């Protein structure tokens, strides 16, 4: 599968598109609220970066604004988890957000998350780290996740699917250059998108658990994740 000049220029555009928060601090009321506030504002920053990345993707703004919202509502968490697994450090078992501070499993627990979400985030991040994806493989997989035709309330399913397949073909042609003696490396990346839906559903159980303990989400995260 030969990489075309049209695919080459598209891939490099996606790499180039990827190029103040409340600070993390005894255990008190103020301590657990600020850690929850730091973690959720890192998510707010991420959504804004996801939207801005999606605008740069060929075919996205030509879709209806409704379909743009529909794709970004359900894929936001999946892009966030992919970007989490990119920043995973295998030696310390921790993830570096915002280029300075690293966060382990107990740091995720201190930020308000339950353990049945945390251990699936970290197992996935360890499994993604074994595959050793670069910037171009990550940007393509983010784009395949955004352009999923089977998301709720998507009108033009045929165009979203046709768009998806062009990034899929670009991924096949890229990985043939990157791993030319391993043909399994292209479908191993696609098999991680299977794992990403289970984690998105495990995240739905986390959001539902936050209503039961009354820890309310900020406005932008509440409109994308809470059931109204």
């Amino acid at each position: 599968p030969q990489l075309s000049p049209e695919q080459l220029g598209m891939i490099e555009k996606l790499v180039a598109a990827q190029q103040r928060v409340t600070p993390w601090p005894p255990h008190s009321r103020e301590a657990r609220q600020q850690r929850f506030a730091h973690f959720t504002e890192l998510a707010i920053v991420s959504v804004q970066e996801i939207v801005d990345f999606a605008k740069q993707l060929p075919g996205f703004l030509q879709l209806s604004r409704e379909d743009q919202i529909a794709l970004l509502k359900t894929s936001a968490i999946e892009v966030m988890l992919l970007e989490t697994s990119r920043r995973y450090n295998p030696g310390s078992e921790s993830i570096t957000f915002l280029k300075d501070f690293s966060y382990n499993r107990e740091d995720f627990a201190k930020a308000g998350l339950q353990v049945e979400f945390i251990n699936p985030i970290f197992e996935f991040s360890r499994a993604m780290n074994e595959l050793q994806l670069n910037d171009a493989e990550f940007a393509l997989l983010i784009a395949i996740s955004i352009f999923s035709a089977d998301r709720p309330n998507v009108q033009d399913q045929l165009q979203v699917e046709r768009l998806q397949h062009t990034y899929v073909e670009a991924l096949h042609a890229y990985v043939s250059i990157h791993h030319p003696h391993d043909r399994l490396m292209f479908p191993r990346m696609l098999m991680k998108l299977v794992s990403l839906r289970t984690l998105s559903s495990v995240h739905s159980e986390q959001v539902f658990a936050l209503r039961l303990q009354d820890k309310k989400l900020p406005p932008l995260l509440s409109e994308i994740w809470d059931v109204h």
Partner: peptide, 15 residues
């Protein structure tokens, strides 16, 4: 619609 329920997300896509 979804657009009426996602006012902040719509405004990020508009800007």
């Amino acid at each position: 619609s979804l657009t009426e329920r996602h006012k902040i997300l719509h405004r990020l896509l508009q800007e």
